[PDB]
């Protein structure tokens, strides 16, 4: 059998097996610094509740910290299909501070965007399981939820935050909890009487190091290459009818940027990045006489049908010169994550990368907005002429039009992820470029 192939060697094979460098069937493993992982609970300052601001200071139990998991215990105020990642919506603002300097700040909407772009098939399902009710649970069900953080030191051990090296400066996590969480204490805008307040706890996973490496971490200077999220809110320009509006949005970014991601949403309904329609999963009661297109199917606010999107085309312009020729929204929703990430992004969330592998940490290409005087994102909208209530029209139309319900999406959220350097020495840390 196999020897009949083994002897089948010709001149063309010299490129593959001549004077080998690698033997596949004798692998060598690296010996590593001994460490142990421990999950330790932190103490929260401030009253826990909807709309409240709380904070916690990370105790030095270990040498390095990596994963941070925030948990909430919630009671659902409605029946099945009335919530959408309620733990993610609740975790409205989280920011990382080291010694008084803000390092990064994430929003509930960024977490859904991240999920829309970079978490893969079973990982994002698991993420949903940790953040929503996915088993058709009924009103009154209680569930414990986990929302992991994605700061620069949260996903990979290589950037673990060295509290051991920060002997003189505190590291804190500030939280603001949403005042309205769909299906938990509000249904749309209507309060749910008797809704319970959340129980909140923050866990940090500590790394304990062996003797020789802890000494080095504590004494020597370190250069950490870290990522930051830049954000400010914008307004949409979604047309009324008969026209495709243009909108030139001025960008407020600095630093070497890996990518720009953005979405359009209804600020009242978390996760509603597209227009609503009287088709399955696209609005409350869709498909029967009770269907209404001004209220989403809250358990299923995300879709993959870009037909309900608001964005027709976009381009990124730098100092008045187009960085690339105009592309349609379907490019930014489906082709960019295919080329740069390898997963599926639902309709209404758009990505353009400057990097070959923005999903990873090893730098692979950046746009440095500290050297670009005027960078803009130019949008073209779809014409909002489709009657959302008529499946014949919703599922049967062209590229340049969208639903009349598209005009409900009023918030334009443009995100940028950049590189920076966290310098740690003398027991204190801070940014190289502030």
């Amino acid at each position: 059998g196999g020897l009949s192939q083994l002897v089948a060697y010709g001149a063309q094979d010299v490129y593959l097996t001549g004077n080998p460098q690698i033997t596949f069937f004798k692998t060598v493993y690296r010996r590593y610094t001994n460490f142990a992982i421990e999950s330790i609970q932190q103490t929260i300052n401030g009253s826990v509740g909807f709309g409240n601001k709380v904070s916690t200071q990370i105790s030095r139990n270990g040498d390095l910290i990596t994963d941070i998991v925030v948990e909430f215990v919630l009671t659902k105020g409605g029946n099945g299909g009335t919530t959408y990642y309620p733990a993610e919506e609740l975790l409205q603002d989280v920011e990382l501070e080291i010694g008084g300097q803000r390092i990064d700040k994430h929003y509930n909407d960024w977490f859904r965007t991240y999920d829309a772009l970079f978490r893969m098939n079973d990982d994002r399902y698991n993420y949903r399981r940790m953040t929503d009710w996915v088993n058709n649970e009924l009103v009154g069900a209680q569930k414990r939820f986990y929302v992991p953080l994605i700061f620069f030191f949260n996903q990979t051990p290589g950037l673990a935050l060295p509290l051991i090296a920060l002997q003189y400066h505190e590291v804190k996590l500030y939280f603001t909890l949403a005042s309205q969480v769909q299906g938990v204490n509000y249904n749309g805008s209507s309060a749910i009487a008797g809704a319970a307040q959340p129980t909140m706890s923050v866990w940090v996973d500590y790394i304990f190091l062996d003797t020789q490496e802890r000494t080095r971490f504590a004494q020597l200077p370190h250069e950490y290459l870290i990522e930051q999220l830049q954000f400010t809110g914008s307004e949409t320009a979604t047309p009324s009818a008969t026209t495709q509006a243009s909108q030139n949005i001025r960008l407020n970014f600095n630093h070497p940027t890996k990518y720009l991601a953005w979405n359009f949403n209804n600020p009242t309904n978390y996760g509603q990045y597209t227009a609503l329609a009287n088709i399955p999963g696209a609005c409350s009661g869709a498909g029967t006489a009770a269907a209404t297109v001004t209220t989403p199917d809250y358990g299923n606010t995300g879709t993959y049908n870009e037909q309900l999107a608001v964005l027709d085309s976009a381009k990124i312009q730098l100092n008045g010169q187009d960085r690339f020729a105009t592309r349609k929204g379907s490019y930014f929703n489906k082709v960019q994550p295919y080329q740069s990430i390898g997963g599926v992004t639902p309709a209404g969330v758009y990505l353009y990368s400057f990097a070959l592998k923005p999903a990873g940490r090893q730098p692979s290409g950046t746009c440095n907005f500290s050297r670009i005087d005027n960078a803009t994102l130019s949008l073209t909208y779809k014409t909002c002429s489709i009657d959302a209530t008529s499946p014949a029209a919703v599922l049967g139309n062209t590229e340049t039009v969208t639903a009349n319900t598209a005009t409900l999406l009023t918030a334009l959220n443009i995100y940028a992820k950049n590189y920076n350097v966290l310098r740690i020495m003398s027991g204190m840390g801070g940014l190289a470029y502030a």
Binding site: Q167, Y168, P221, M425, S426, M428
Partner: peptide
């Protein structure tokens, strides 16, 4: 000992456990 080294570009640290006190 697990305290920060002497040579650095960041000068304002206050070494503890070696103070005259009041």
């Amino acid at each position: 000992s697990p305290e920060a080294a002497d040579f650095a570009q960041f000068a304002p640290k206050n070494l503890q456990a070696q103070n005259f006190l009041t």
